[PDB]
Coordinates of C-alpha atoms and ligand atoms in Angstrom, one line a residue:
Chain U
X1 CA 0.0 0.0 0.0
X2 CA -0.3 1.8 -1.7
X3 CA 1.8 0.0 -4.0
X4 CA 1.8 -3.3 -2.8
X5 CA -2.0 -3.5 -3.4
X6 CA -1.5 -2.4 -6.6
X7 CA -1.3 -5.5 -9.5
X8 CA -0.1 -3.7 -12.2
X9 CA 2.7 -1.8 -9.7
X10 CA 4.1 -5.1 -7.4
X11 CA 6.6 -7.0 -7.4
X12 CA 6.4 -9.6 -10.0
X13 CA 9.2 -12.3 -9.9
X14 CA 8.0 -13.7 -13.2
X15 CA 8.1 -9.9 -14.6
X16 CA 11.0 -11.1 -17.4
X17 CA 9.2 -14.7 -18.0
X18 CA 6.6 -13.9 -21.1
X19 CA 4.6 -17.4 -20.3
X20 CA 1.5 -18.0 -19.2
X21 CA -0.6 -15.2 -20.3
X22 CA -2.3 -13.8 -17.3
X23 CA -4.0 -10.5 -18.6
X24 CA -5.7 -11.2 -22.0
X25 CA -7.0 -7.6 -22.3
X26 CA -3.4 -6.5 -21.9
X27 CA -2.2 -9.2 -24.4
X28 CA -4.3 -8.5 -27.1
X29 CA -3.5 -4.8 -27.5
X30 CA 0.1 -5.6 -27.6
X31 CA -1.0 -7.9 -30.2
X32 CA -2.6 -5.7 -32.3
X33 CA -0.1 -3.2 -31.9
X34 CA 2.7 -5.7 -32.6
X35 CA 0.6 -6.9 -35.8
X36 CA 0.2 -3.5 -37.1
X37 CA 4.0 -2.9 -37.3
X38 CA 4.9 -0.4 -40.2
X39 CA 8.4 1.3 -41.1
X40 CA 8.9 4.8 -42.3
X41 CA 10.2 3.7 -45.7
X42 CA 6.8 2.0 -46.8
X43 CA 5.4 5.6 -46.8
X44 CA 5.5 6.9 -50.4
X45 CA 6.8 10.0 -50.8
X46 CA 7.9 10.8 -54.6
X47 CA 4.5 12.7 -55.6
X48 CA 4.0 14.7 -52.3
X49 CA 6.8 17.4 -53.8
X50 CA 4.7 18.9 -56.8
X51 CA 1.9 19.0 -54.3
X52 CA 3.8 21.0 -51.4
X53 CA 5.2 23.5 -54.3
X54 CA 1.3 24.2 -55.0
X55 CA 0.5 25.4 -51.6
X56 CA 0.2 28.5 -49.9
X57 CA 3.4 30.0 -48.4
X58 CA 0.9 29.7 -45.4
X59 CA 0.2 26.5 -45.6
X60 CA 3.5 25.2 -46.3
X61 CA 4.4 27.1 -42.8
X62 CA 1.7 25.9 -41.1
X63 CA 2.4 22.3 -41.8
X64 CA 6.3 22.1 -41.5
X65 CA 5.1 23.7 -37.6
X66 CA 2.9 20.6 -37.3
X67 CA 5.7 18.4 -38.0
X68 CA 7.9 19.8 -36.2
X69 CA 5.4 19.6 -32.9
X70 CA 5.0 15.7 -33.7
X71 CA 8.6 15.3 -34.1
X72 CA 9.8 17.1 -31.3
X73 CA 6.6 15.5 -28.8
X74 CA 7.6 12.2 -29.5
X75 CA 10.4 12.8 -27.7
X76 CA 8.8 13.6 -24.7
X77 CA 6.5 10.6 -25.2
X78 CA 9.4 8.2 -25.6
X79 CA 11.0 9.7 -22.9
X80 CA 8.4 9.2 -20.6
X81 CA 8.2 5.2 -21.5
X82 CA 11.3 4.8 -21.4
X83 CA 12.0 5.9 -17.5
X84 CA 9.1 5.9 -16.0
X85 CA 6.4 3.9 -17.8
X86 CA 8.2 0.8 -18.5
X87 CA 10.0 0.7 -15.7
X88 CA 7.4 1.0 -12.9
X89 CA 4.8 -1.2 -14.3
X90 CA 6.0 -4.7 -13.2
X91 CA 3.1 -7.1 -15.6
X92 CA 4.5 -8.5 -18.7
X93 CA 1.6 -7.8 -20.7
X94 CA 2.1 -4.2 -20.1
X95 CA 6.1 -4.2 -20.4
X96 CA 5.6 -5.8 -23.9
X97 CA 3.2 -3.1 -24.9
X98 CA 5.1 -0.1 -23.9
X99 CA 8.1 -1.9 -25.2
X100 CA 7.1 -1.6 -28.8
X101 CA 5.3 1.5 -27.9
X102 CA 8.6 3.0 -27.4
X103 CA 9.7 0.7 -30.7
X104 CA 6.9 2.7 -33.0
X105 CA 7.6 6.4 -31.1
X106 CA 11.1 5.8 -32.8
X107 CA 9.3 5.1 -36.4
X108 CA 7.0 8.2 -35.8
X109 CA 9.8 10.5 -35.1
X110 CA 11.5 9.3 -38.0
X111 CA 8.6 9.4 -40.0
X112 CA 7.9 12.9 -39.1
X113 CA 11.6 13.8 -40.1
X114 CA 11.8 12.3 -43.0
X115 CA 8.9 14.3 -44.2
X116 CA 10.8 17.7 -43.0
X117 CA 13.8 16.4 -44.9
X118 CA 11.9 15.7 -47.9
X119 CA 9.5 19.3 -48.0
X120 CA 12.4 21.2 -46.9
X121 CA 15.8 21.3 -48.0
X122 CA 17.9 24.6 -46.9
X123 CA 19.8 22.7 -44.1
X124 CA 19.1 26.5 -41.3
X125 CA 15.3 26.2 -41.6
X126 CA 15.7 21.9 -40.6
X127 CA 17.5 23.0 -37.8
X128 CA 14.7 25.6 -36.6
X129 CA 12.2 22.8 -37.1
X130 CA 14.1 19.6 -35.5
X131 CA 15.0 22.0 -32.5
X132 CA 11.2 23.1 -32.0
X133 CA 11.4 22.5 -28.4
X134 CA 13.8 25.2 -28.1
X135 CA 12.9 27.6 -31.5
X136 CA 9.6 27.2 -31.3
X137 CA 7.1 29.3 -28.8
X138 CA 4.3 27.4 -30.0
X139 CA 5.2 24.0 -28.5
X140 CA 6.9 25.2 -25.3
X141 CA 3.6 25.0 -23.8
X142 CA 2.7 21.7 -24.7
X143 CA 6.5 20.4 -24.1
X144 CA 6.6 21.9 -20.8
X145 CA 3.5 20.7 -19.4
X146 CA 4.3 16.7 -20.7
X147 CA 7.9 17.4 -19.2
X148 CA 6.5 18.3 -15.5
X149 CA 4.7 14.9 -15.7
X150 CA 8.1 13.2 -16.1
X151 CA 9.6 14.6 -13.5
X152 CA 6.7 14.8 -10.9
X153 CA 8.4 12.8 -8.3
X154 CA 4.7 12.6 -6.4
X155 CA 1.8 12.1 -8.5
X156 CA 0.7 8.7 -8.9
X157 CA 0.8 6.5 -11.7
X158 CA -2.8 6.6 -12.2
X159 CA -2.6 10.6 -12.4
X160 CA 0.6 10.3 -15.3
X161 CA -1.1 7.9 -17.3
X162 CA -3.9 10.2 -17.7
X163 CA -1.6 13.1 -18.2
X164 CA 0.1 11.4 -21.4
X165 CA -3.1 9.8 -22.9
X166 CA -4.3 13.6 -22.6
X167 CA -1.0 14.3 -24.4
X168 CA -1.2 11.2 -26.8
X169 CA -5.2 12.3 -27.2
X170 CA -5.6 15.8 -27.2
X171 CA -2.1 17.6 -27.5
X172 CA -1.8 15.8 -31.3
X173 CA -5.8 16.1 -31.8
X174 CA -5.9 18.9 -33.2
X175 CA -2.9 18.4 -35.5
X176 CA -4.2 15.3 -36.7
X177 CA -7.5 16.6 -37.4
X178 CA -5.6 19.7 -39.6
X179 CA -3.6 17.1 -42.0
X180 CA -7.2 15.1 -42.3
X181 CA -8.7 18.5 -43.2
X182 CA -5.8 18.3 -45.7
X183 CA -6.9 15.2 -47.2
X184 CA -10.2 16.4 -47.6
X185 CA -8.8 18.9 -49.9
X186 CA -6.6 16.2 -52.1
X187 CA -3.6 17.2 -51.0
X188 CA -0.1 15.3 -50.1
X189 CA -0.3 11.6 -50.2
X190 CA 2.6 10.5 -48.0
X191 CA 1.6 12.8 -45.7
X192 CA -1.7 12.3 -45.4
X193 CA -1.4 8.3 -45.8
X194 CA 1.3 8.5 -42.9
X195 CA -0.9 10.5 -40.3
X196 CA -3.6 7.8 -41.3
X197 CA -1.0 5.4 -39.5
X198 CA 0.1 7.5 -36.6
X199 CA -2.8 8.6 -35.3
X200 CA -4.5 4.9 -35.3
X201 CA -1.4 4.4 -33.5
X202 CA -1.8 7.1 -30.8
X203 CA -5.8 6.1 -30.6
X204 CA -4.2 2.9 -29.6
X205 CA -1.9 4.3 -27.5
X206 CA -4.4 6.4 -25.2
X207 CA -6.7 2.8 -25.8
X208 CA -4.0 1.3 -23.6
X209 CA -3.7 4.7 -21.8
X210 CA -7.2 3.7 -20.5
X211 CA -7.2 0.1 -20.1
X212 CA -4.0 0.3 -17.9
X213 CA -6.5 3.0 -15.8
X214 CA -9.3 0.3 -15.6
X215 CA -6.9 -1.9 -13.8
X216 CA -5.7 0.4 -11.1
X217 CA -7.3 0.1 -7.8
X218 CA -6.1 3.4 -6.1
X219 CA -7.0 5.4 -9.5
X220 CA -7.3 9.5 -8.9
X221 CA -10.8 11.2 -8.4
X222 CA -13.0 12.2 -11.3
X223 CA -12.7 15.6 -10.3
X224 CA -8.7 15.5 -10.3
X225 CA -8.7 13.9 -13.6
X226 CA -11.1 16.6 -14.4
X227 CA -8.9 19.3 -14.5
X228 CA -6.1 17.4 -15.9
X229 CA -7.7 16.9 -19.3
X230 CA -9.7 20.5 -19.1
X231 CA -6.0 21.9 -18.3
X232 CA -5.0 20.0 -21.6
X233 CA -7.9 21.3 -23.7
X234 CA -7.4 24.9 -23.2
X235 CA -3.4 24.4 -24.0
X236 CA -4.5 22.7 -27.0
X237 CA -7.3 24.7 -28.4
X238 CA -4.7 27.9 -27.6
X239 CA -2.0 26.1 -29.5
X240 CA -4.6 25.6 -32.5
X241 CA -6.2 29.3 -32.5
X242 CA -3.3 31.6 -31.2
X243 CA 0.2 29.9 -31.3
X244 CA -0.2 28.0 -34.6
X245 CA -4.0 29.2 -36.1
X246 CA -5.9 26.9 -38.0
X247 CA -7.1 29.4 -40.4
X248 CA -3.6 29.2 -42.3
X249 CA -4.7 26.1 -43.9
X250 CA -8.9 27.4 -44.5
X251 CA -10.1 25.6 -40.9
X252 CA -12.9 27.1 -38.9
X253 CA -11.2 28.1 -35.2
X254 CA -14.3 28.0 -33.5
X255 CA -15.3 24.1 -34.9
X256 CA -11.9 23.3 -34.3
X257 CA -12.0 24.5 -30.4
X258 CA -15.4 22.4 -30.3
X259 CA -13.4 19.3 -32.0
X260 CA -11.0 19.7 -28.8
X261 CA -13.9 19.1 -26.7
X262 CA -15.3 16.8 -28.4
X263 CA -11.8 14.7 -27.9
X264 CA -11.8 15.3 -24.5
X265 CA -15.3 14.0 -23.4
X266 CA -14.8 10.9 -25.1
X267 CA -11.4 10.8 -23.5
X268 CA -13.3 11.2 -20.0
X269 CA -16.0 8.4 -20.8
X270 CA -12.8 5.6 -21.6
X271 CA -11.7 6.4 -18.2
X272 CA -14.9 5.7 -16.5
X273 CA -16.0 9.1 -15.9
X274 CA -18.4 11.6 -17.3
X275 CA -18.0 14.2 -19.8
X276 CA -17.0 17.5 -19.2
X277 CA -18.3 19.9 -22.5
X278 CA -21.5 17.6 -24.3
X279 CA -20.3 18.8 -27.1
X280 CA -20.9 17.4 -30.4
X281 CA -18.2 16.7 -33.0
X282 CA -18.3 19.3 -35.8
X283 CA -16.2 17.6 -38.2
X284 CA -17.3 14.7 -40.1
X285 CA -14.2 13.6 -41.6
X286 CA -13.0 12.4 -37.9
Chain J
X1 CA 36.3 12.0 -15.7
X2 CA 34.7 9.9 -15.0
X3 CA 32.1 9.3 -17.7
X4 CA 31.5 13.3 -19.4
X5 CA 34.3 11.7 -21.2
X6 CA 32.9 9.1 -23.2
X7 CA 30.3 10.1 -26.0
X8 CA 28.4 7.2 -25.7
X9 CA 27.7 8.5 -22.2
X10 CA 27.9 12.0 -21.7
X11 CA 25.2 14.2 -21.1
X12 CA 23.1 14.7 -25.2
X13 CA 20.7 17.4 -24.9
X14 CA 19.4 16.1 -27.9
X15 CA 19.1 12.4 -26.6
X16 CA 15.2 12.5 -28.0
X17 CA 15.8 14.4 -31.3
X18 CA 15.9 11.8 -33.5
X19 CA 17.3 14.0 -36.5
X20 CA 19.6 14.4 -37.8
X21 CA 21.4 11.5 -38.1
X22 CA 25.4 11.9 -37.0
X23 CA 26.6 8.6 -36.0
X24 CA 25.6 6.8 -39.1
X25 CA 27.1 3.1 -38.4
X26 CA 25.6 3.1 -35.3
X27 CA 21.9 4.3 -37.2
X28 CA 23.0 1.5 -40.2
X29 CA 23.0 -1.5 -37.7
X30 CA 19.2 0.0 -36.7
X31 CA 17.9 0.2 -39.8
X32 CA 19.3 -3.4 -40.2
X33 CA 17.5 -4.7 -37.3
X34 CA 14.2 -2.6 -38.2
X35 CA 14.2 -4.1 -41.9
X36 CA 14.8 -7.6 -40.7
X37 CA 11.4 -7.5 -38.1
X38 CA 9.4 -11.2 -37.6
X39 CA 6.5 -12.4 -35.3
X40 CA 5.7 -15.4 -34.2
X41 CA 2.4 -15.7 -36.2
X42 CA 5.0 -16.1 -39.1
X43 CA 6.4 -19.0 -38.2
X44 CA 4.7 -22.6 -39.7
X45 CA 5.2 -25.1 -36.7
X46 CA 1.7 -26.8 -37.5
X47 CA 4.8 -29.8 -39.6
X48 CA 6.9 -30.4 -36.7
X49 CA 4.7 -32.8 -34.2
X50 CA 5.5 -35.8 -36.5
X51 CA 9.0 -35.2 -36.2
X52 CA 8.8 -34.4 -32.3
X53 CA 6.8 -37.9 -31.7
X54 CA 9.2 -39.8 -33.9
X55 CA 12.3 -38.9 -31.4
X56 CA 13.8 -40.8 -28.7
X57 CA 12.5 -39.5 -25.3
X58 CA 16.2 -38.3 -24.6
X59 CA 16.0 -35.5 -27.5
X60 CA 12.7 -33.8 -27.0
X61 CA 14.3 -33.7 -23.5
X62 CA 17.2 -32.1 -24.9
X63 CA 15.2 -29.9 -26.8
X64 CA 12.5 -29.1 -24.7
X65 CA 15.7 -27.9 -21.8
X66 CA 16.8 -25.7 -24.5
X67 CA 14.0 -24.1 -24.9
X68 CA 13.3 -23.4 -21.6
X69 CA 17.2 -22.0 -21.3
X70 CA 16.4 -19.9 -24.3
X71 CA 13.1 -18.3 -22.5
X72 CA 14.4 -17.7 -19.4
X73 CA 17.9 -16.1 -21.3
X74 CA 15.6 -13.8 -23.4
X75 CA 14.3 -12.3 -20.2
X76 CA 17.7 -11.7 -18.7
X77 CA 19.2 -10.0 -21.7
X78 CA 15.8 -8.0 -22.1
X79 CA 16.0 -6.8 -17.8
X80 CA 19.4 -5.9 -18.9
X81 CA 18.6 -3.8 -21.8
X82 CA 15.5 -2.2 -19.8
X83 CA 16.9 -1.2 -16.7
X84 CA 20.5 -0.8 -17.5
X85 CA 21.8 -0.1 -21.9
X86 CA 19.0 1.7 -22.8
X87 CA 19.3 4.1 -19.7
X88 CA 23.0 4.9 -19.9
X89 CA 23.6 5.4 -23.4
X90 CA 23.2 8.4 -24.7
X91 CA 23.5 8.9 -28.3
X92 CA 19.4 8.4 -30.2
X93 CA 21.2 6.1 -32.9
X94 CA 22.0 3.4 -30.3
X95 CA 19.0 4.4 -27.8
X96 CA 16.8 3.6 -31.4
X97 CA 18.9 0.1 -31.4
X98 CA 18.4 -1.1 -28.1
X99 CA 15.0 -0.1 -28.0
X100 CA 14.3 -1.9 -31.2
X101 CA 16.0 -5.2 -29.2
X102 CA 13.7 -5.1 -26.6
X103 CA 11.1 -5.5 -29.0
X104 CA 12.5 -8.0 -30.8
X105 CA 13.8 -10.1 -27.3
X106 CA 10.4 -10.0 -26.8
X107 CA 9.3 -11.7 -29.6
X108 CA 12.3 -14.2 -29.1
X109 CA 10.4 -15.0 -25.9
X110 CA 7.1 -15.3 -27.4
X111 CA 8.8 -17.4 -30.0
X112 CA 10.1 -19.8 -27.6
X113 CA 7.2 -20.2 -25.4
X114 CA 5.3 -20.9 -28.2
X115 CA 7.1 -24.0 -29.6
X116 CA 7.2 -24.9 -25.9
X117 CA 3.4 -24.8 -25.9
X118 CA 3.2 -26.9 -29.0
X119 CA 5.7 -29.6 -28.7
X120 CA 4.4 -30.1 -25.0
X121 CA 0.6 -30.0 -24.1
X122 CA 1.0 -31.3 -20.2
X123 CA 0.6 -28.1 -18.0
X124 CA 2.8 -29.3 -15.1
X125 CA 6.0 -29.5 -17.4
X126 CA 5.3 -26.3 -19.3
X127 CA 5.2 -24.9 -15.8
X128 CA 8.6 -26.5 -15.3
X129 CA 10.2 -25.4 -18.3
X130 CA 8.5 -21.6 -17.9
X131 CA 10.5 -21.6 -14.5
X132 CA 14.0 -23.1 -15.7
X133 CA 15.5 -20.1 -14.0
X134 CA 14.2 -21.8 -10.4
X135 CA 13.8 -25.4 -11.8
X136 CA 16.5 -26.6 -14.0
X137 CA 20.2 -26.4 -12.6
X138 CA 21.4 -26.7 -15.8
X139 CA 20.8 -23.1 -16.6
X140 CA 21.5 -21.8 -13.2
X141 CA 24.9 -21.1 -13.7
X142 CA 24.4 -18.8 -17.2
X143 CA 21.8 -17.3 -15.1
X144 CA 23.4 -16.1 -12.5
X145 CA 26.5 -15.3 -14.8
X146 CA 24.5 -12.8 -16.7
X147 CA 22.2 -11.4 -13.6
X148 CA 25.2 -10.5 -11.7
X149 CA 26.7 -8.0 -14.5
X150 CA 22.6 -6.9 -14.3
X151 CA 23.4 -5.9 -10.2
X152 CA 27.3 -5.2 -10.8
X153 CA 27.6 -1.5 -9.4
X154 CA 30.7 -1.0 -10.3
X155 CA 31.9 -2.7 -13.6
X156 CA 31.8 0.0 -16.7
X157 CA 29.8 -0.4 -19.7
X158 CA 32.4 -1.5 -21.2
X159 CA 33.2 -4.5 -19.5
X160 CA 29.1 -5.3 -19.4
X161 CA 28.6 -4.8 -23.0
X162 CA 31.4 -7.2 -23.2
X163 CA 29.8 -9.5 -20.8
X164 CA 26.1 -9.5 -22.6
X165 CA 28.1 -9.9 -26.1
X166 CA 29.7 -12.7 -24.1
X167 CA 25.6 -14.1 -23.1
X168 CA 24.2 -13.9 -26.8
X169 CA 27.3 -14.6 -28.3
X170 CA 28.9 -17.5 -26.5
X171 CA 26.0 -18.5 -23.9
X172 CA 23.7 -19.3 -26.9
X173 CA 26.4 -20.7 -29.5
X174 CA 26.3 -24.7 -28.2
X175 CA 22.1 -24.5 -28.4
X176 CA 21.8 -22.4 -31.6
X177 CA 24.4 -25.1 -33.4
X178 CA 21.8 -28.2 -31.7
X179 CA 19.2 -26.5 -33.5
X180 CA 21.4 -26.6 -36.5
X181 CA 22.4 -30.5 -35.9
X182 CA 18.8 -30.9 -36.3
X183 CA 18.3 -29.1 -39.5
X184 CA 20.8 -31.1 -41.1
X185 CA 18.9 -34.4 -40.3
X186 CA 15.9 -33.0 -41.5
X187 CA 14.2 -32.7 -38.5
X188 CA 11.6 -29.9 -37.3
X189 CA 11.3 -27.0 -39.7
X190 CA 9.6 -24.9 -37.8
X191 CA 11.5 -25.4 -34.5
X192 CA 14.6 -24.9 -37.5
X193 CA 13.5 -21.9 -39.4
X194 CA 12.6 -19.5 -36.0
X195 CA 15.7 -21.1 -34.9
X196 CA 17.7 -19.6 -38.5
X197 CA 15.8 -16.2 -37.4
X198 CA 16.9 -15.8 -34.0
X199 CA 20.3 -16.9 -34.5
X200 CA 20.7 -14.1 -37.0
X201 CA 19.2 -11.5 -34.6
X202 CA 21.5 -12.6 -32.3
X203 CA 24.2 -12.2 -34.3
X204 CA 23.4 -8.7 -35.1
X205 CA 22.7 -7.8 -31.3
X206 CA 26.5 -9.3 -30.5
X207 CA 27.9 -6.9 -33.8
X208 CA 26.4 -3.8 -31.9
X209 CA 27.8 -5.0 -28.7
X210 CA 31.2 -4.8 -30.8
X211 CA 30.2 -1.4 -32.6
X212 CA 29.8 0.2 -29.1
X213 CA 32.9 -1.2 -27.6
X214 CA 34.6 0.2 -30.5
X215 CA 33.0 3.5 -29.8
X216 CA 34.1 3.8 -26.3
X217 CA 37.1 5.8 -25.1
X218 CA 38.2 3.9 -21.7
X219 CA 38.2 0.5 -23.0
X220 CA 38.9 -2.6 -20.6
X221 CA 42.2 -3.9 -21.1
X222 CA 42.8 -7.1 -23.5
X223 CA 43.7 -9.2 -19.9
X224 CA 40.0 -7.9 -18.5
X225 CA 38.1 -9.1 -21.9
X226 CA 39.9 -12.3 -21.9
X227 CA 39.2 -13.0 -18.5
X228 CA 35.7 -12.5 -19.4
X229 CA 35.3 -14.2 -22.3
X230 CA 37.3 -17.4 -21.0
X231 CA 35.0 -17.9 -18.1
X232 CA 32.0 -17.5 -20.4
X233 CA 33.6 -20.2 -22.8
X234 CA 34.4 -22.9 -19.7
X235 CA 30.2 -21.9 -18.1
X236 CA 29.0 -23.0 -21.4
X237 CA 31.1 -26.0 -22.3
X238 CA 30.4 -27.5 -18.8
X239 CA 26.6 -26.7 -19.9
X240 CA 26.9 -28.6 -23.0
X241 CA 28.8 -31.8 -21.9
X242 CA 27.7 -31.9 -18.4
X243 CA 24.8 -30.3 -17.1
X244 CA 22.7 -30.8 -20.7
X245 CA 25.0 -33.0 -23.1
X246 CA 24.6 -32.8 -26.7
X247 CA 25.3 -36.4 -27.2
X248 CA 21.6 -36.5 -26.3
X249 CA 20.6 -35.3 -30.0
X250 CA 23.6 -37.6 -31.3
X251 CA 26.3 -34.6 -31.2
X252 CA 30.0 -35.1 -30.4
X253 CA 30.9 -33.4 -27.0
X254 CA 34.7 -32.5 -28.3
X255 CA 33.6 -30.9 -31.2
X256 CA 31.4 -28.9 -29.8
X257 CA 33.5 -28.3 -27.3
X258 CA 36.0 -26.9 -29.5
X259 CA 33.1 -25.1 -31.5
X260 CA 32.9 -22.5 -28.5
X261 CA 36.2 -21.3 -28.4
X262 CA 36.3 -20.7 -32.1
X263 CA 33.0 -18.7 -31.4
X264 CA 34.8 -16.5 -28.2
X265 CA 38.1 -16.5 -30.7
X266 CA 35.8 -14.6 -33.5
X267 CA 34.3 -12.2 -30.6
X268 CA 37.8 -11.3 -29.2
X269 CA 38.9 -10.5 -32.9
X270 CA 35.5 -8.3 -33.4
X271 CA 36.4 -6.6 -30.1
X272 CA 39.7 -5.5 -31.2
X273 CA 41.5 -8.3 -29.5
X274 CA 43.6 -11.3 -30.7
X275 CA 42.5 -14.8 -30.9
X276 CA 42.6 -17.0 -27.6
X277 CA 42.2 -20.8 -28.4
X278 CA 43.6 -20.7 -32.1
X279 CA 40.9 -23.4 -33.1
X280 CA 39.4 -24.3 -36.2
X281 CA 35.3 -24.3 -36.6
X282 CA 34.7 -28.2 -36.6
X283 CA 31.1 -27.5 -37.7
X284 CA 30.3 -27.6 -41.9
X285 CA 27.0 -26.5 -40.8
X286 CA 27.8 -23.2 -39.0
Ligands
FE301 FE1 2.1 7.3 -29.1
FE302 FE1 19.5 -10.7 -28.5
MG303 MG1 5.3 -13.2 -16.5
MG304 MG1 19.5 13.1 -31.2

């Protein structure tokens, strides 16, 4: 106690044997994660070129920002997993999934630089973008707020899963709805196709996110949990309408700020709570 | 002074950056591993149960044993890679490798467990076999080899990279060459082909133990590596002959014997180092 009562948390001396399966839920998301294995180099590129020439300077900035924030919050993710995550959870089931969690982070990254290298060549403005952490207002919110969750030496387990689903869920919500809205308009098909694979990927992620919530027994009140993920919306929907506005690429601020929401409720309802904002979700291409 | 000195080590700012790329036969030996992935699923072992029935009881309890060793190995390697490589290295490119590893160990476990499962249907021996690290004393020595440079305060990185090179380099030469005997009499291709797969990885996870060593600035002394290496050799030539002896599957106890030290010989020389034993490979098949 707490720890000790906690299954997912105690010591496990069969925590490096793989056999028997014990938790089946567990098991089968690291099997579907493990069977939806992709690499950065199926992605094809060669036509998205002529398409990013097309664009609006706007546009064009608007993007390379989003990939740099996806790049650059990987990171953070990864880091995360890899020190704290995988370490403190002591079930099998769970230390395979975060394993190649931390496996397909790697392949995101890489994906997400690879498309940076590929749209933009003058060697200065890849810098800018691959040190976004640091060059980039924007993101320092978002950054800073998933790097206090890594080094919070009190808050529970329970209280930093949530934390990163709400970063896996509703920090890369937004941007994942912009490159959809993209699609909708025809344009970049390596970009678009790859953001089809990374955010099933994250939906999986916070999936687990919320399974490994379910099988806590000390989890956090609703009402703390509450204002971690209302916290999280309001960074987001100021990232999308202020930092980085959605309008550059034709979006509708006010639908998008409702899209947030929208996220965040259904986010809340996974994790066995209530919603926070009823709101419906304006876009029907998500 | 002591370790701001090494760049394998030292503090990297950009530890989570994954671009660009600067140490680029460190990120080669990823993308190797990355382009080479497997599952289990992929592996056809639905041929093998007519060969495992047509055995004399003495091999499938050779082979089942090493199995088990296998299993329980995987997990060592993998605590090692979770809790101690993956933590203190510091460069991405080798952070992307060893993270890849664990995914792949992973599936070297499943792998193992599974052909367990299928060869042997009684639950109180796949119990037996899942626990080889507390049931079989035939493994307890390699075990406790390789779990001591886990809880080793003190030795360098250098001398443990060494020492895990030395665990899936020369603790799993004598089994991976049984699986081999077998091949060559036809027998088992399932057991044979996953056997051809993980050999291969394990190859590869033994040439980046070498990469790294290369790539470190306070190196062990030749003495120190030899001293390692030697005891490895005599732990897993007492396992072969004595504690599980290949003359069970029909193999000769010299020759395999004498297989090992041309294995450690072929280690020292991808360390930097000069040959030890001076012994030919008696094995055609290898
Ligand atoms: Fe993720
Ligand atoms: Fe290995
Ligand atoms: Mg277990
Ligand atoms: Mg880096």
């Amino acid at each position: 106690m707490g720890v000790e009562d906690e299954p997912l948390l105690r010591e496990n001396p069969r925590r490096f044997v793989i056999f028997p399966i014990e938790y089946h839920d567990i098991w089968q998301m690291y099997k579907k994660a493990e069977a939806s294995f992709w690499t950065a180099e199926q992605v094809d590129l060669s036509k998205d070129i002529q398409h990013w020439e097309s664009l609006k300077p706007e546009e064009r900035y608007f993007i390379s920002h989003v990939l740099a924030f996806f790049a650059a919050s990987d990171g953070i993710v990864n880091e995360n997993l890899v020190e704290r995550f995988s370490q403190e959870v002591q079930i099998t089931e769970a230390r395979c999934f975060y394993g190649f969690q931390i496996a397909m982070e790697n392949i995101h990254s890489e994906m997400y630089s690879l498309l940076i290298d590929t749209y933009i060549k003058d060697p200065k403005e890849r810098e800018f973008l691959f040190n976004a952490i640091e060059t980039m207002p924007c993101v320092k919110k978002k950054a800073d707020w998933a790097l206090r969750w890594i080094g919070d030496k009190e808050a529970t387990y329970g209280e930093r899963v949530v934390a990163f689903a709400a970063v896996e869920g509703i920090f890369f919500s937004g941007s994942f709805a912009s490159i959809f809205w993209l699609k909708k308009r025809g344009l970049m098909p390596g970009l678009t196709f790859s953001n089809e694979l990374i955010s099933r990927d994250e939906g999986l992620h916070c999936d687990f996110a919320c399974l490994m919530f379910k099988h806590l027994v000390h989890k956090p009140s609703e009402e703390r949990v509450r204002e971690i993920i209302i916290n999280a919306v309001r960074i987001e929907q100021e990232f999308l309408t202020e930092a980085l506005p959605v309008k550059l690429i034709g979006m509708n601020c006010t639908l998008m700020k409702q899209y947030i929401e929208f996220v965040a409720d259904r986010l809340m309802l996974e994790l066995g709570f209530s919603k926070v904002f009823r709101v419906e979700n304006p876009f029907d291409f998500m």
